[PDB]
Symmetry: D2
Subunit: 120 residues, 4 copies
């Protein structure tokens, strides 16, 4: 089985820590991004998400509320377990910027990927 | 101030209810999609997310754990208020499918938009 | 049959003209965006793409080389015809910004939608 | 400088060959995908795109018209040259499926990434 609980790093060097996954698949945690628009402002930020529970290789999503920005990121992906028991989270994300009004909405959403592996 | 608590519909005819937003910006709710890969299977599905609290037009994210599929969707966006006090959630989403192993990961993520308005 | 040759406008107020589609489905055209990072700089910009030829409601893609920015946008979508013969291009786009080096790549891609209808 | 002309492979094993880039930045080529929904049907497929010309690390876009599917992919990205002169294309893509009518449009667009390096 693949549970999101534990510490992970991604290909950009970011670290996240996920706490216990409850029987609904809900989890909370923290996210320390390695990069930001203004990296001098980065602080540890909370995340909240849901994974599927029954599946051995569950899909999941989570939201990161950046504590140093008005932006928000969502990640979604799947936890894969390989033939040696190694786990990888394959994810894609949307990063929503805050803009002043709806005329700027078109430019407010970035997209990308991240691959996560366990810290230990 | 643009509020997320309440009942919403989107341009595809889906509806969602969002409960009280706590001091950390966290909220739960229930999502009824109007469309699915297998629409005969649609059931009500829980959502869990975070919005920014201070901002008048906050960004936010949430995860929908589909209760009838192995897939997961994440939505992110911003709540805008126009001159007459009418709210719109401008959102983008990623829909993650479950695939068998990492070699199929490339085809597992769909993207789209949704605009939500308040029900009555 | 849903045709791409002609003049189109989208939900942001941008317009484009598309020239004759050749036997391989290839087409050129000119794009006038209604919005930009620096809207004072907007100039007409060339587009180049390919549609499917046989299909009545073809999928297609095109690239817009912005003539006033180092960025590039790609659009992909499908041309639909309703019961009355009215056409709509349902599209999604990626907008690539120029960044200084690969360590900034994560923030360089924006995503969004556009719906196009025929001008008159 | 970074010109797209030449042969490239990506992280999925796909190969593309780009021909001469003209003075407008337009280029054509072919794309042999390693993966598809129906890999038994894969055939070499044409691409058409535009890069920026003046920039040492240009952004670009291209469209692949799959010759074995009704789908279309667009790629956009940037060519980076590192301190040793090695080139990498960092890209993201949208893959548009053909659906029967507009009621299915919501599920028709996949998103992903690819990193390309030169074959030789
Ligand atoms: O910088 C931010 C907040 C931090 C985002 C980190 C992103 S989350 C996707 C990716 N994966 C990671 O591990 N880290 C990155 N937001 C922001 C950036 C730029 C602008 N802007 O206006 O340019 C506005 C908000
Ligand atoms: O059908 C599903 C689950 C329901 C997804 C509804 C989407 S969420 C984005 C959009 N906005 C809405 O309000 N509703 C739609 N998932 C799914 C679909 C197709 C496949 N597939 O393999 O084709 C696998 C899983
Ligand atoms: O402004 C630009 C170039 C023009 C892009 C217009 C976009 S194409 C998707 C959408 N549909 C339209 O019809 N028009 C918009 N690029 C740009 C924007 C912002 C930044 N930035 O750094 O913030 C860099 C480059
Ligand atoms: O399979 C296809 C056509 C080939 C797409 C190859 C993609 S392009 C992005 C990525 N990078 C690569 O180098 N290769 C992959 N299209 C398709 C797939 C599935 C469905 N479907 O309905 O499930 C419809 C069309």
């Amino acid at each position: 089985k693949c549970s999101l609980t534990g510490k992970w790093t991604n290909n950009l060097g970011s670290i996240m820590t996920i706490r216990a996954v409850n029987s609904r698949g809900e989890f909370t945690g923290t996210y320390l991004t390695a990069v930001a628009d203004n990296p001098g402002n980065i602080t540890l930020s909370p995340l909240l998400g849901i994974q599927h529970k029954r599946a051995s290789q569950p899909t999941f999503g989570f939201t990161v509320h950046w504590n140093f920005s008005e932006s928000t990121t969502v990640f979604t992906g799947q936890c894969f377990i390989d033939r040696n028991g190694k786990e990888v989270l394959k994810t894609m994300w949307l990063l929503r910027s805050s803009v002043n009004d709806i005329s700027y909405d078109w430019k407010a959403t970035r997209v990308g990927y991240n691959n996560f592996t366990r810290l230990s």
